[model samples]
Target: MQTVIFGRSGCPYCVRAKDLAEKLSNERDDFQYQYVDIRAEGITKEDLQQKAGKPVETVPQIFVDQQHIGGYTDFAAWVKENLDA
Candidate 1:
């Protein structure tokens, strides 16, 4: 599966999300991880919001196979349930 983590630098949640993605990728070759820094130049902020589809404006929004997978805590729960088993 392709995993994308959208977040800015200096974000703690982003770090954790990256950690989780890295963990999964390291353990399984089937996973691919990409990191997006919204603060970096690319498109308008509105476009980011449109892509994210929420107004909380936080970091580390993850997508797996083009589907929203939420942030660190959400991913942690997933890992606990799936990876540990």
Candidate 2:
């Protein structure tokens, strides 16, 4: 599975989201993720918003197979329900 998590610094949920993705990758060879910190140079919040097709109100917006999967908590739930095997 391919996933992306757009996050920013100092957000606890972002930390959790990154950790969760990392943990899954560690546990499963098929799970792959990139935690995109929006605070990084040339990576704007608007870039993420554009991909999500809406105004992002928070950090840790996640996507799987290029489909928007909402925020950090939703990401985990979505993974468990849809990707877990």
Candidate 3:
């Protein structure tokens, strides 16, 4: 599994999202994720919204296995459904 997270420095949800992915990678051999700081990349919410194909009103925009999975709450739910074995 592969996860990509786009977020900034001050977002707590981003922190949790990343930490969760980190835990997954630590526990599963094929699980991996990347954290991309939006500020560092000069990315805006509008850009993210375009990628997500939905309204993005928060940080921790996440994509897992090439699927747009929204923010921290959505991400955790997807993990529970797919990865919680």
Candidate 4:
């Protein structure tokens, strides 16, 4: 499964989310992720909303295997439930 993170540069939460993802990836070979930077990749806020099928007001919108898992907080909860041992 592919984990995707839509985030922007200069956002602290985005950085944390990225760090957490990297840590998880280091721990598990199966944990693969792509962190997309809105600014760097030219992704607009509306683009995220369209992909998410919901309103996105912040950075770090995350997904696991195409399932919308939301932002950093949501991603943290998911990691606790699904990734933590």
Instruction: Report lDDT (Cα) of residue 57, candidate 3.
Output: 73
Overall lDDT per candidate, in order of appearance: 0.71, 0.78, 0.82, 0.79
Q: Candidate 1 at residue 78, lDDT? A: 69
Lowest summed lDDT window (length 10), candidate 2? 38-47
By descending TM-score, how would the candidates be arranged?
Answer: 3, 4, 2, 1
**Model 2 lDDT on a 0 to 1 scale:** 0.78
- Candidate 4, clashing residue pairs? none
What order do candidates take by lDDT, descending? Answer: 3, 4, 2, 1
User: Model 4: how far is 50 from its true place, Å?
Assistant: 1.4
Backbone clashes in candidate 2 total 0
TM-score of each prediction: 0.76, 0.83, 0.86, 0.85
lDDT by residue (1-85, candidate 2, tens digit) is 7778777777687777778887888788888888777767468667778888785476668888779888887888987897567
Candidate 4 displacement at residue 62 in angstroms: 1.1
User: Where in model 3 is the C-alpha error above 4 Å?
Assistant: none
